[PDB]
Amino acid sequence: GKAFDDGAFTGIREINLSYNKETAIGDFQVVYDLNGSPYVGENHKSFITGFTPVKISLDFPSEYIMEVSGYTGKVSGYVVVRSLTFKTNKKTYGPYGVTSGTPFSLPIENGLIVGFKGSIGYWLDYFSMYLSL
Amino acid sequence: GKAFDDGAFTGIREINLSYNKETAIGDFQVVYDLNGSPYVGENHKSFITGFTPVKISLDFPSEYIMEVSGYTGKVSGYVVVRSLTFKTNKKTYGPYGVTSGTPFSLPIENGLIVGFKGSIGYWLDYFSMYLSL
Amino acid sequence: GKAFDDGAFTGIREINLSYNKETAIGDFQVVYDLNGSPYVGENHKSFITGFTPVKISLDFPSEYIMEVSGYTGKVSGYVVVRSLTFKTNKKTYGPYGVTSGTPFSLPIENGLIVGFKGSIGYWLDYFSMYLSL
């Protein structure tokens, strides 16, 4: 698909994503914190429609992501991110998508997610996270 | 004076400042880099006029500051920043202001200046720098 | 089990571990780099024996870990790390131990593993990794 890279910021205020309960993650967008102010990240979109939108609004700065988990699997011959879960120090958001295939989990004992990068075709092909203290 | 804090960014593209050959540094503003695009920081203005404007436009990303030096001294009874010099891997910018008082120097062997904070009244009272790898 | 925490170092020169295909990782010991010198970390030994020893010697500093993956599973009523694989920019070391249970993977695009902490009883109960630029 199309690669995207938001770069690094100072924290996370909101995650706006979309999913289909039969396929995988569709659209992915982040409202970052940039030195005490909201910074609206670009909306990374699927080349197809039919996804269910989800708004994960965090209580910034007291609330922050402590774990990102999900599943990677084959949808129409393509290995994509089928599901995502975001656990904060306050609550669990998800799972969104299909809890099928190969699981993954990024627990954080110290530090913060400060950015996202990845690729989206029909679905989220892959993603990486920027971590900082 | 009025305190300011730009916070942290991914680099420095330009420093816009003002000085008076009789007193000290006046205005201070920075165009940062934020994930490969410019980010115009807030203009931090002196409470007075009569300053000589200066534009330090950096050849970002190959040109970066390696040393910040200057002088702190008394002007009308206030302890302020009287002069500034910016040394990059390519050029020396300055001194701007009066080279009188207590010298200070911040040479960097590894890392980058990614942000500025300080205070400005009639003159730049003080400043600090954010450092990152 | 017995909790351990090596802390943070400059890098990794060697990983010593042990495993048994019917159970899990027994031993874990790291030879770190500390400012250019090897620094022999404490040997985190299993309470029992019967493991196949493994020495992972890295061509430090050119060779470094880009991914740690493995599997967790229930062994004798305990959730432990059954298998580990370390991938470098040179080659793949492992899998060491059976590839069965819940997989986990920590691929790295930028930065380095600089330390380990965790717990060992009969087997490696869990572990975390220190990351740094």
Binding site: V81, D125, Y126, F127, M129, S132 | L112 | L131
Partner: peptide, 15 residues
């Protein structure tokens, strides 16, 4: 270079 860097973990998904 004059670009600050950050630790990056991933990618999870298609390799």
């Amino acid at each position: 270079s004059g670009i600050s860097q950050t630790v990056i973990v991933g990618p999870w998904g298609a390799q």
